[PDB]
A paper describes a structure:
Bacterial contractile injection systems (CIS) are phage tail-like macromolecular complexes that mediate cell-cell interactions by injecting effector proteins into target cells. Using Streptomyces coelicolor as a model organism, we and others previously demonstrated that S. coelicolor CIS (CISSc) mediate a form of regulated cell death, which influences the onset of sporulation and secondary metabolite production in response to exogenous stress and unknown cellular signals. The purified assemblies were subjected to single-particle cryo-electron microscopy (cryoEM) for structure determination, yielding the first high-resolution model of the CISSc in its extended conformation, which also presents the first example of a CIS IId subtype. Our model shows that extended CISSc particles share the conserved eCIS architecture, including the three core modules: cap, sheath tube, and baseplate.
The baseplate module comprises a heteromeric assembly of the proteins Cis1b/7/8/9/11/12. The symmetry transition from the inner tube (Cis1a, C6) to the VgrG-like spike (Cis8, C3) is adapted by two layers of the tube initiators Cis1b and Cis7. The first layer of the sheath (Cis2) is bound to the conserved gp25-like protein Cis9, which connects to the baseplate ‘wedges’ composed of Cis11 and Cis12. Importantly, the CISSc ‘wedges’ consist of two copies of Cis11 and one copy of Cis12, resembling the baseplate of Pyocin R2(27). This is in contrast to other previously reported eCIS, whose baseplate wedge comprises only one Cis11/12 component (AlgoCIS, AFP, PVC) and a Cis11 extension forming a cage around the spike. (f) Ribbon diagrams showing a single baseplate wedge subunit, which is composed of two copies of Cis11 and one copy of Cis12. Furthermore, we did not detect any structural components that resemble tail fiber proteins. Interestingly, this analysis identified the baseplate component Cis11 as a significant hit and possible interaction partner of CisA. Importantly, such a protein-protein interaction would be consistent with our cryoEM structure, which shows a peripheral surface-exposed position of Cis11 in the baseplate complex of extended CISSc. The resulting maps of the baseplate and the cap reached resolutions of 3.5 and 3.4 Å, respectively.
Author numbering:
A (entry chain e), B (entry chain d), C (entry chain c), D (entry chain b), E (entry chain a), F (entry chain f): 1 to 140
G (entry chain l), H (entry chain k), I (entry chain m), J (entry chain p), K (entry chain n), L (entry chain o): 1 to 149
Write the structure that this text describes.
Amino acid sequence: MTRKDPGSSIWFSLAIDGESLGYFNGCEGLSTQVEVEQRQEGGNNGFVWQLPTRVTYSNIRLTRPLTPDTAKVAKWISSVQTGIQRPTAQISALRADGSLVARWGLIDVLPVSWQGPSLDPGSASVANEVLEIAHHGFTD
Amino acid sequence: MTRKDPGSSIWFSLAIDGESLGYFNGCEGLSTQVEVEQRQEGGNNGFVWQLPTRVTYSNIRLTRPLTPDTAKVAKWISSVQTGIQRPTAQISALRADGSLVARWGLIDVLPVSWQGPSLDPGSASVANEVLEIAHHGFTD
Amino acid sequence: MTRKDPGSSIWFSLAIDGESLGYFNGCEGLSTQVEVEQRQEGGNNGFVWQLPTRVTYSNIRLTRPLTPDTAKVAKWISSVQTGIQRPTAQISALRADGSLVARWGLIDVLPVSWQGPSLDPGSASVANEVLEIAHHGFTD
Amino acid sequence: MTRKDPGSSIWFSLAIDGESLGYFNGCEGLSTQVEVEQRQEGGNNGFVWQLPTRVTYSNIRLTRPLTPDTAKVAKWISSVQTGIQRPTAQISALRADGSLVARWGLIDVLPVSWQGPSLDPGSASVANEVLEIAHHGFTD
Amino acid sequence: MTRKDPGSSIWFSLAIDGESLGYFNGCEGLSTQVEVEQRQEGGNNGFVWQLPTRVTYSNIRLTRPLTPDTAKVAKWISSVQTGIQRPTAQISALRADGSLVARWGLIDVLPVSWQGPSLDPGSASVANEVLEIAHHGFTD
Amino acid sequence: MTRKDPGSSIWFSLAIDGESLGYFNGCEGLSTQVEVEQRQEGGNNGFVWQLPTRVTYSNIRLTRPLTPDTAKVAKWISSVQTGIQRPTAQISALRADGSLVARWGLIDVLPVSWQGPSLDPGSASVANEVLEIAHHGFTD
Amino acid sequence: MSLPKPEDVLVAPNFGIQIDGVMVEYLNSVSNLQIEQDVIRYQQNQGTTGRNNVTLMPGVAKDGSVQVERGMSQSSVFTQWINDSMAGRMATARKNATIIVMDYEDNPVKRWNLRNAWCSKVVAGTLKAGDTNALTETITIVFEELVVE
Amino acid sequence: MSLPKPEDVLVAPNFGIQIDGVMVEYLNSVSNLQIEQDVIRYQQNQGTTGRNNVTLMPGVAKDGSVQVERGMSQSSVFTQWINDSMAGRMATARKNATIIVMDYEDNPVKRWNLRNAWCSKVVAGTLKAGDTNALTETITIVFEELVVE
Amino acid sequence: MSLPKPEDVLVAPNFGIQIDGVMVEYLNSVSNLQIEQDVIRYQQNQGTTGRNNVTLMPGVAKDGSVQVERGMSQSSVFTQWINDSMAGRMATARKNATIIVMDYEDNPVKRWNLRNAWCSKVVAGTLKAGDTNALTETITIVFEELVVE
Amino acid sequence: MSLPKPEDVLVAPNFGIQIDGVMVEYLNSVSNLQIEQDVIRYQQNQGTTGRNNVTLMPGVAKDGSVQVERGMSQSSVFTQWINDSMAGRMATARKNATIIVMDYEDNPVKRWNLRNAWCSKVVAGTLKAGDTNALTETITIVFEELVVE
Amino acid sequence: MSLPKPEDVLVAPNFGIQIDGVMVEYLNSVSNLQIEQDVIRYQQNQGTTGRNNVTLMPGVAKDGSVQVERGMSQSSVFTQWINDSMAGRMATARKNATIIVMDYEDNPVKRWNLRNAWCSKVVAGTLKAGDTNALTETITIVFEELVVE
Amino acid sequence: MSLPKPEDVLVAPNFGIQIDGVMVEYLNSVSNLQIEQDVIRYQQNQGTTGRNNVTLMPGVAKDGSVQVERGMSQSSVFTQWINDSMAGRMATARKNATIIVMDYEDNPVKRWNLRNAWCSKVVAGTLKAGDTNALTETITIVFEELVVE
């Protein structure tokens, strides 16, 4: 059977295509939701009918260390004035061996927010720019 | 008596039938509520009458380690467009002997949300995908 | 004065009568509120009148270890469709030996919610089902 | 003078007159406020005029260990249906010597809430009933 | 430069004029904002105009140890019925030498709230009455 | 690549032009959001179209030790009655070598709030005035 | 007991529990009857903060008393006890227990009647290649109810 | 007491408690009068936080004195005190107490009156098959009011 | 087992791990059969808070053994084991192991089977120019499931 | 101060506090003049680190003193000091104090003036029956304002 | 080497770092090959906790390895390394490193290749006037990647 | 100096600071240069979590080095420094310092130039009546910038 240990929260691979955003360093909130609609059957006490309605994908917060290649993402965001591009990106989780556990792919990408570094004379850390991203669908 | 058979909160068995979702790893929020209606009698100070009105079953969050069999869940969730299926679930608590202390079976389930793994280069843990579950009633 | 007999918060006795709910293990929130209507006398400043209006009793959350006798609770809760009995309850506080400090009693009860156990494969504890109970007034 | 007589917050004396509520053990929230009304002078940027309007006194939460004399406060609260009584109340701060620092008094009182003891088999503490009390004005 | 003389947050001086309130012990929240108004140019994406309109000063919470001279404050607050007085207050921050770093002043004060001492039999602290202060501008 | 040179959150340089504000000591919240309008295509279920709309820049909170040069900031803020000059600020992130990683700049600025020092006789720290800056486009 | 000033000696341990005993037992080094307290800062009327009133609590158990069966001989009785609790089977793991104390002459005088034995820990000594002492198969036994007598 | 330099000697304890004491008493330690402090960091008009005046407290209590009966003989008095407290029965648990300090010659000179005592620990020494010293039935006694004198 | 109480003199270890052995292996540190408890506070209708129930939990495992191979000779198997786990390759790094305890005469009597070994640590001894006592290439081995037997 | 190597010897303490002192006394424990710490990591415009600026702090009081009077003779001034504070009466509680340091020959050379004494704790030594040492009525004295000189 | 029972005895270190850290140098230590351990509490049909699954981690590195160049001679090369790192200049501070181990005869047998060296600390021994040993200029060296071999 | 194997032995301190130090300065203990470190867990695209990238921090300071002026002689210059400095007056309180190290022959070789001084504490030794050694006026000089050279 072997020991197919599952995706550790450490090994991964994050990337964006198209505009030279490169490879990122952290991900959060990758999620798909459906909006159930609840109708209470009048003549029957005991439950409330659950009926599915549409599917929606929530936004993702990708973070990376601040590197001189941050001029690209700022340029990409400001490109919305003269025409934007939706490149297709990926999110993958791996094990220590570098094999593949589950590879998801964002069908289309739209920037939403870019929380820049939090400069601080005291705190001993490393600047972590936060680039949000708007989901559009899962690839297959 | 036999020194009783006390309940416990480690040994369990969490499963979903139907699509090959398999056995999960952690439950939460399994709850039933009613919606009392408070009518206050005008001429009798001292209390507000409590009258029962319907019952309502809350959502359930199930978590498990991110295994390569997570493709089944995304297939199930994204099947709303072409037609969904409600299998029958189960939530059972056990003692270490493997015997049964209380067995609950969800009458009809329905996906609501799927919060995927939270990849993080610095946090030593294991990815825990979360599959929220809608409800229709307990079984007997 | 027998060095007094000061109340404490460990020794107690919690029970519900009627349906075989048995004796519970933890209480919370036992409270009585009296709504006050504030009228600002326009003639004089410096204070706003306070007048009493009605007396409302808040809910109580009773918890106990998950035991095979939890099937009785689900039968009681899911009996709304056929009729609910309101058995009298009892909340009491005792000293070390087991004498009485102040015994309260709920004249009429009603289930409001039942938050089941929070199963978890890692957290070492004991499953504690929570039965929220409505209220109608104290007994004397 | 004489190395001053600095106020403290551990020695006190709390009591309610009239109904045999006796002497309490803890106080909180004793406060007076004035609802100012802000008017924006249209032609003059630089501030907003502040004008006083009325005075309002907030409620007080008094706590004591649960003692068999808690039957009185429950009786007093549930006396609204047949007529209530508002005796004068006293809140005083003291130094270790027992000499007066600043003695306040409540002109007229009224129950608002009575958060009873939080019974718990595990927590090692002492039951502390809470008697919220309304307010009318400071005596002089 | 004489090794400069940077400000700190221990040495200070807090006082109110007029009624014998005396010298206080701790300030907080001294602040001045500007109410900007955002208007979005229709034909020019990429930014939102930041038009500056007015300026609003915020309240100040002054705290001091409870001393027998607290009768003056209650007299001042409860004088709004028969006519109030707005003295001129000062807030100054000093270095250890007792020199001046930045001396602010309050053009016209007005009481807002007076949170009295939080009496407690267990906690080993000292009563700290809080006197909120309304504002009219900075003196120059 | 000479072992790279990744950015960090200790070395920086914060400055505001124009009035003699000088150089500040700590930034926060530098961000560029993009408002997205969600339209749910009724024909097909599976996502919600994401369409970009405008770009808005959030506020920036700048902090520095309280120095006698704080009189300039109050003069600048209280100049809104006679007109505000809007100089061009600068936010930069550096490495220990003093070289550049990514230099940003603020096209136009506007004071929004100035939270003064929080004087406290007990806590030991440096008084840190906070200046809040409204924003415009990014320079290039 | 023979003299008018007896005080016992360290050399008199033995214990009869339903699981088989062993020949030599070097140690048993914890035996508590702990009960905790409170703090009530009760106020009378004249103004004093009052005495620190104290009350009565559960006789908190969990006084596992570590035992030291000097020598992991071929007798694997202890490791069979724990191997049951690990897999459950509480019908045979929840063992009643006792501890016997004898005089200057070997005769029981006081017995520490336990109420629920568990054997929740088995730890072996260091396998140093050159030391002189023996091997200690230290056992930790947990209670449900505190000791009696 | 005799010279103006009384080296008041360690070897002179005894105590009379209403519950019968012991002929033999191995240990007595950890008795004190404890009061804490506030820290007001007051301020003047010169701005100097020059001093931090301190103010009076409750008489902090629960001073666990720790009595060490030299040996657990057949006298089960101490374990009857705790076993009585565990079930309540304050008529016999809340016992007054008095530790006596004796002069260089065996006469009482100073007495620490214990206003309200109630035991909460009857921990016992370890049993080693090969040691030399004796069994110590250590007792921890809790107060309500601080000791007097 | 030659006599009634000959126990097990600690000079008789040897490992049996799948990777190549070692001549000396001059230490072997703590091994455990760890399993802690739970706590319920159940009280009967009588009013007592009742004996605190103690139920069970999983065998915590994660037992760490600091096998000390006295002397870092050219045998690099220990540092090949960890360097293997640094990059992955569970096919060669998840090797079950065995600790052998031998009788007073050098024969095996008891074996501590380990269900999974990891070698998550190798630490070298200090190199003091002028000291003695050789170099110790201490190894820490982690488990997945606890030891057996 | 006889020669430029004075090394003021430590065996010369005494103190006149307002309440009566004692003939025998020793072990005057730690008495310092402590100052706080202020941190303000300042930033210039070279992008440099900025040496962490250090500022001034309030003279922090509450310097605990552990006076050790040899034995509890019939004198009870120390326990009258604390028993007086525990109830109030600052007219007789807040008293000045002065530790005197004496020269190699018994003459005073340096004096540590204490602005306000409190006597916030008196603790007695162990009462072991068989020890050879003496009782110690250790005191703890705190301050409102730090020592002077 | 020479025997099948060798030990890489003490008194045989050296280095080859590009900073001229040569001649007198003793007591390097605390070398490590860190790897921590994950935790999963896996579940199955049976309902047993499924033991304790453990999975791999990053190579922790950051191994501060302490070097003690006994005696700060006129050579100040160590303090030039840290003073270089303080202002930056990674072209000269981020130095590669190597620790050499020699066998019973002074010949290298194993090398602990160090990927990146930093020298983030330098301390000095106590300057007591009247003691015997020498000042020790202990250096702490940090890494970016773990040691190799 | 004398040999390629030198050792600046412990016996060669001295302090040249604008506060008039005197013959006895004796013990002097803590002196170091700390920089500290951070962690970047940067990962590329091969899937590895990557080495723990480490980057530079500021020059951590406040390394008070304690100067034990053996003997509280009549020279009260140390307390004076604390005093005036306590009441502010930084015009005469910064007082950049210097620590001198010499060879066997009293010639300076390495000097730890300082940048700012505080003298933020001064503790005297125990005053036991019957001890043997001297009185120590320990100091806790604090910096603003780190040492140099």
